[PDB]
Design a protein around this motif. Structure first.
Motif, PDB file in Angstrom:
ATOM      1  N   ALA A  39      55.117  38.229  49.936  1.00 21.74           N
ATOM      2  CA  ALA A  39      54.223  39.158  50.629  1.00 21.74           C
ATOM      3  C   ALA A  39      54.896  39.984  51.730  1.00 21.74           C
ATOM      4  O   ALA A  39      55.742  39.474  52.474  1.00 21.74           O
ATOM      5  CB  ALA A  39      53.040  38.394  51.228  1.00 21.74           C
ATOM      6  N   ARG A  40      54.460  41.249  51.857  1.00 21.02           N
ATOM      7  CA  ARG A  40      54.907  42.244  52.834  1.00 21.02           C
ATOM      8  C   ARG A  40      56.211  42.900  52.397  1.00 21.02           C
ATOM      9  O   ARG A  40      56.260  44.125  52.244  1.00 21.02           O
ATOM     10  CB  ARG A  40      55.013  41.620  54.229  1.00 21.02           C
ATOM     11  N   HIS A  65      51.058  32.336  53.568  1.00 19.33           N
ATOM     12  CA  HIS A  65      51.063  33.412  52.582  1.00 19.33           C
ATOM     13  C   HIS A  65      51.385  32.910  51.186  1.00 19.33           C
ATOM     14  O   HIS A  65      50.905  33.484  50.210  1.00 19.33           O
ATOM     15  CB  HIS A  65      52.051  34.510  52.969  1.00 19.33           C
ATOM     16  N   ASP A  66      52.178  31.849  51.060  1.00 20.14           N
ATOM     17  CA  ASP A  66      52.341  31.233  49.750  1.00 20.14           C
ATOM     18  C   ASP A  66      50.991  30.757  49.223  1.00 20.14           C
ATOM     19  O   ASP A  66      50.630  31.014  48.063  1.00 20.14           O
ATOM     20  CB  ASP A  66      53.364  30.084  49.841  1.00 20.14           C
ATOM     21  N   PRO A  81      46.667  45.424  48.669  1.00 22.01           N
ATOM     22  CA  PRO A  81      47.825  46.254  48.287  1.00 22.01           C
ATOM     23  C   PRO A  81      49.004  46.092  49.234  1.00 22.01           C
ATOM     24  O   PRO A  81      50.161  46.021  48.792  1.00 22.01           O
ATOM     25  CB  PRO A  81      47.256  47.678  48.341  1.00 22.01           C
ATOM     26  N   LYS A  82      48.722  45.947  50.529  1.00 16.87           N
ATOM     27  CA  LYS A  82      49.776  45.813  51.530  1.00 16.87           C
ATOM     28  C   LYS A  82      50.648  44.578  51.286  1.00 16.87           C
ATOM     29  O   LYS A  82      51.783  44.523  51.765  1.00 16.87           O
ATOM     30  CB  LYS A  82      49.150  45.813  52.938  1.00 16.87           C
ATOM     31  N   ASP A  83      50.125  43.547  50.611  1.00 14.42           N
ATOM     32  CA  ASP A  83      50.951  42.369  50.351  1.00 14.42           C
ATOM     33  C   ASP A  83      52.019  42.609  49.280  1.00 14.42           C
ATOM     34  O   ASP A  83      52.961  41.809  49.168  1.00 14.42           O
ATOM     35  CB  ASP A  83      50.058  41.198  49.973  1.00 14.42           C
ATOM     36  N   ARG A  84      51.888  43.670  48.481  1.00 13.10           N
ATOM     37  CA  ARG A  84      52.896  44.021  47.476  1.00 13.10           C
ATOM     38  C   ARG A  84      53.147  42.889  46.477  1.00 13.10           C
ATOM     39  O   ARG A  84      54.288  42.614  46.099  1.00 13.10           O
ATOM     40  CB  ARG A  84      54.209  44.438  48.157  1.00 13.10           C
ATOM     41  N   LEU A  85      52.086  42.217  46.034  1.00 11.33           N
ATOM     42  CA  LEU A  85      52.245  41.077  45.134  1.00 11.33           C
ATOM     43  C   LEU A  85      52.057  41.424  43.655  1.00 11.33           C
ATOM     44  O   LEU A  85      52.237  40.550  42.805  1.00 11.33           O
ATOM     45  CB  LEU A  85      51.267  39.956  45.524  1.00 11.33           C
TER      46      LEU A  85
END
Ligand SMILES: [Mn+2]
Ligand SMILES: [Mn+2]
Length: 269
Positions: A39-40, A65-66, A81-85
Motif C-alpha cells: 500500500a501507498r 495495512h497488510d 485507489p490511493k492504496d495502489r493495490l
C-alpha cells in the motif's frame, strides 16, 4: 548477519537498493520486516513476491495495512485507489500470495538475541507469555478458513484495557489494536487510538507506549515500525523504531543487529 527493515509500503526499488547496499545474502543472512509491506508505494506485488520467495531467510510480522489488504481481498472492505493495490489484487498469483500472507505471525521472538518484534510494539500491560498467547490466538483465526469473519470483526477501537478475562470479539479487537495500531498510552497502559502525531505534539497525560515500563521491555530489546511521525527518534535504549516513512518521501532504514549499524536509503521522489 541479521538485518531489520521498517515499513516498506510497496517501495520495492528502495527495498532492493538497501539490500544490495548491505549485500544481503539469503542463506548467510536473515531479514526481519516490521510489516506494512503493501500500500501507498507502487510495487506491492513485487514486494510480496520477493518476501514470500525468501522463505526461512525472512521473519515478518503483519501490520495494519497488510490486514487491510487481506480485508479488501476477501470482500470485507472497500479498496482505496490511493492504496495502489489493484495490480496485486488482479495478479494471477494473488491467491497464492495472500494465502501465504495471512499465515504469517504477529510477533517474532529470538531468545539468543533477546529480541522481540511486532508491528506497533509490545503493550506494557503484557508480559511475554501473554503477548505470545494473544499472537497465537489471532494467528489461528487468520490462517483458518474463516478469516474473513475475523477481518470484519477486527475493526473497532474498544476495549482499550487488557484483562486475561476478556473474551470473544473484544479480546480479538484489543489484541489486534495492540499489535498493529498502538502508539500512545494512558499512564495505566490503556490504549489511545486517535493520536497519530509525534510524542511532542500529544497532549498530557499521553505518553508513547515505550515510555511506560513493561515487563517485556525490561528483559528484551523491541523493534517495531508503524509509527511514521516518530521518524525513528526519541526511543529509550533497547527500543528500535525502524519506520522512517519511505512511502511518504522519507527514508527506508535497515539496522544490522550484530553491530547496531544503520543503513539508510532515500525515498525515490
Ligand atoms: Mn502500520
Ligand atoms: Mn506503516
Amino acid at each position: 548477519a541479521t538485518y531489520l527493515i521498517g515499513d516498506v509500503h510497496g517501495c520495492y526499488d528502495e527495498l532492493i537498493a538497501l539490500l544490495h547496499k548491505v549485500e544481503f545474502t539469503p542463506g548467510k543472512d536473515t531479514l526481519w520486516l516490521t510489516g506494512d509491506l503493501v500500500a501507498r508505494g507502487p510495487g506491492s506485488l513485487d514486494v510480496l513476491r520477493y518476501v514470500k520467495s525468501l522463505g526461512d531467510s525472512v521473519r515478518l510480522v503483519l501490520g495494519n495495512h497488510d490486514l487491510h489488504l487481506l480485508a479488501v481481498f476477501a470482500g470485507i472492505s472497500r479498496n482505496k485507489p490511493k492504496d495502489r493495490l489493484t495490480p496485486l489484487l488482479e495478479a494471477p498469483d494473488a491467491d497464492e500470495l495472500l494465502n501465504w500472507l495471512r499465515r504469517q505471525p504477529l510477533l517474532q521472538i529470538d531468545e539468543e538475541k533477546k529480541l522481540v518484534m511486532a508491528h506497533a510494539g509490545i503493550t506494557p500491560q503484557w508480559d511475554l507469555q501473554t503477548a505470545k498467547e494473544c499472537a497465537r490466538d489471532v494467528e489461528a483465526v487468520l490462517s483458518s478458513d474463516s478469516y474473513p469473519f475475523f477481518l470484519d470483526a477486527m475493526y473497532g477501537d474498544m476495549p482499550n484495557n487488557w484483562s486475561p478475562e476478556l473474551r470473544g470479539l473484544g479480546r480479538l479487537r484489543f489484541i489486534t489494536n495492540a499489535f498493529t495500531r498502538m502508539r500512545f498510552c494512558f499512564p495505566n497502559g490503556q490504549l489511545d487510538m486517535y493520536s497519530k502525531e509525534s510524542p511532542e505534539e500529544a497532549p498530557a497525560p499521553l505518553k508513547p507506549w515505550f515510555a511506560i515500563p513493561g515487563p517485556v521491555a525490561e528483559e528484551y530489546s523491541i523493534a517495531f515500525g508503524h509509527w511514521a511521525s516518530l521518524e525513528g527518534k526519541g526511543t529509550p535504549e533497547g527500543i528500535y523504531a525502524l519506520d522512517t516513512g519511505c512511502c511518504w518521501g522519507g527514508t527506508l532504514t535497515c539496522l544490522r543487529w550484530e553491530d547496531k549499524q544503520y543503513f539508510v536509503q532515500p525515498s525515490n521522489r
